[PDB]
């Protein structure tokens, strides 16, 4: 059932790209699971690329991130996108992870990944399923490019010389 | 253009070294490829024929009014463009910019029965101007309503003569403009103009692009 999906990209001549044959023997309720994992990776990667660009360009908020122990948003931004990740206090990291996990638990109990392949029922911008398949393919391609891009940003910030066309 | 260039010129005719008639031109088509080229054939002719005749009057006499007057005449008129004020350069380009925008309006072009040139319309056809937000006495082509009573044979002869005089003048002005800077380019003239500034730079004497 891997030949159906949406992910058939014209960059690989509109056929399924599985050189290691990872989806040869995987069955339903796992194919939908790996599609849900890919879609969540897509969305988190796109949000991560936008946030990384916002931090690297410098933007940041105005105020004090944790008035008990200093640390302004300018202090977080000035350390860089990667090195300015430990400048956040541990309580802020735990609160962010707790809110994300509450959303994860609610959406997993409401829309299980094994049954719903990455579909959490967010409205929908079009009917006419051909256009919707085109929009799904656009989402998949954008998310895959963002998956490559955020790891590229992390590698270029940590190891200089890699990613030659890296801004900042 | 079709193979009817034999009417414009025998011996030669559809010479076409760089083929250019089927390169599909933004994916529009082969007819649309022909229509765009034929318009740019004669639009470049109409500018060059007016500019070369424009040259031969500028270098001797100037209009005696005021603003584009009293600047030196014994210089290159390509340099005389650089002596114009900045508001004059903007207003000249934008006035032509209206004429380009107005003539490409397909709803104006279908008032007189024609269409945009590479959708099937005639290559060169300026609109008869009578649809503007406010009326004007004089239009652009045939202002005195003089020579629109001529038969199609005089129009067909004139349209071919417009092309052939067009190709002759595009060589005429550009070879002449190549004589102002880099002197000695045309050994037939070789006795006019100076100045090494770029003629393809209307605002070089005023500001810089970066």
């Amino acid at each position: 059932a891997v030949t159906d999906l949406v992910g058939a990209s014209t960059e690989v001549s509109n056929k399924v790209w599985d050189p290691l044959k990872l989806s040869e023997n995987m069955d339903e309720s796992n194919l939908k699971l790996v599609r849900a994992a890919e879609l969540k990776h897509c969305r988190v990667a796109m949000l991560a690329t936008v946030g990384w660009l916002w931090t690297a360009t410098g933007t940041h908020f105005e105020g004090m991130l944790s008035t008990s122990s200093g640390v302004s948003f300018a202090d977080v931004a000035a350390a860089g996108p990667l090195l300015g990740a430990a400048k956040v206090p541990a309580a802020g990291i735990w609160q962010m992870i707790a809110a994300i996990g509450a959303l994860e638990v609610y959406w997993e109990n409401k829309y299980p990944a094994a049954e719903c392949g990455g579909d959490f029922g967010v409205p929908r911008v079009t009917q006419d399923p051909a256009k919707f398949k085109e929009i799904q393919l656009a989402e998949l391609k954008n998310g895959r490019l963002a998956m490559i891009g955020i790891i590229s940003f992390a590698c270029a910030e940590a190891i200089p010389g890699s990613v030659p066309f890296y801004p900042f | 253009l079709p193979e009817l260039s034999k009417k414009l010129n025998p011996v030669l005719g559809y010479w076409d070294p760089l083929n250019l008639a089927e390169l599909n031109f933004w994916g529009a088509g082969d007819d649309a490829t022909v229509g765009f080229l034929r318009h740019a054939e004669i639009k470049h002719g109409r500018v060059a024929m007016a500019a070369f005749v424009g040259y031969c009057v500028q270098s001797n006499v100037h209009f005696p009014w005021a603003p584009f007057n009293s600047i030196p005449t014994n210089i290159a008129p390509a340099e005389q463009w650089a002596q114009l004020p900045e508001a004059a350069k903007w207003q000249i380009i934008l006035f032509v910019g209206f004429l380009e925008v107005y003539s490409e309006h397909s709803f104006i072009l279908e008032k007189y029965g024609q269409k945009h040139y590479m959708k099937g319309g005639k290559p060169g056809f300026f609109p008869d101007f009578d649809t503007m937000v406010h009326p004007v006495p004089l239009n652009l082509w045939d202002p005195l309503k003089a020579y629109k009573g001529a038969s199609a044979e005089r129009k067909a002869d004139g349209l071919l003569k417009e092309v052939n005089n067009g190709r002759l003048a595009m060589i005429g002005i550009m070879g002449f403009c190549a004589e102002a800077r880099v002197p000695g380019a045309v050994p037939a003239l070789s006795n006019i103009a100076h100045y090494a500034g770029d003629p393809m730079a209307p605002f070089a004497a005023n500001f810089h692009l970066p």
């Binding site: - | 011996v11 050994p187 037939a188 070789s190 006795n191």
Partner: protein, 228 residues
């Protein structure tokens, strides 16, 4: 077709030698277009070379003697006697360029497809007569006379007389090519031509370059001379 006509023309040129093709010149197709095109190209090149040779011999005699036409023109800048080789070194650069352009225009008119099609002829490499220059009745501006026959003094000659004249032209062109090459050799290297040694002077610039010594500009014309 091509080989039989070549052998017949060779026999008509000389009944003793006949077909004299040592380096297989009748068999090598130039632009991959069979032997007929090669034979036509060779015949046209031979006819053009012979005509240029006879004209060059006449011009060399005229330039060596000195027979300047009048005033105002290019004779006012050339020296009063400088032999044939230096006559192409003191003429104006614009004059030499315009002469080369006129020669190229004449060659292109002789090689144009519609120029031969209007006269009822064809190209000399695809089944045509070599050396058949087209007339001048299509250049829109009315030409006063044709280039082949200006006064049309050969409009009643027979085809046999035309063939005999073509054979005589080919033979005289070969003789003129030999004579012109001998004069060029004697003008540069002594001891080549034994009879012509000591007549023509020595030329420094080689006679195989058109832009050798660029000529002076020179106005040489009045009344409206806005071009310097």
């Amino acid at each position: 077709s091509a080989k039989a006509d070549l052998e017949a023309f060779a026999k008509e040129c000389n009944p003793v030698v006949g077909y004299w093709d040592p380096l297989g010149l009748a068999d090598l197709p130039l632009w991959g277009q069979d032997q007929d095109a090669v034979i036509g190209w060779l015949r046209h090149s031979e006819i053009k070379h012979g005509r240029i040779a006879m004209a060059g011999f006449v011009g060399y005699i005229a330039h060596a003697n000195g027979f300047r036409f009048g005033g105002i023109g290019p004779q006012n800048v050339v020296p009063e006697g400088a032999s044939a080789p230096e006559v192409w070194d003191s003429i104006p650069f614009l004059a030499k360029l315009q002469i080369i352009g006129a020669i190229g225009v004449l060659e292109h008119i002789s090689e144009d497809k519609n120029f031969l099609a209007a006269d009822g002829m064809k190209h000399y490499m695809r089944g045509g007569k070599p050396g058949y220059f087209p007339t001048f009745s299509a250049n829109v501006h009315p030409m006063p006379l044709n280039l082949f026959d200006p006064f049309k003094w050969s409009k009643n000659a027979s085809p046999e007389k035309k063939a005999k004249g073509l054979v005589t032209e080919t033979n005289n062109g070969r003789l003129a090519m030999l004579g012109l090459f001998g004069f060029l050799s004697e003008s540069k290297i002594p001891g080549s031509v034994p009879a012509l040694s000591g007549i023509i002077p020595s030329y420094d610039g080689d006679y195989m370059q058109p832009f050798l010594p660029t000529g002076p500009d020179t106005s040489l014309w009045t009344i409206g001379n806005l071009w310097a």
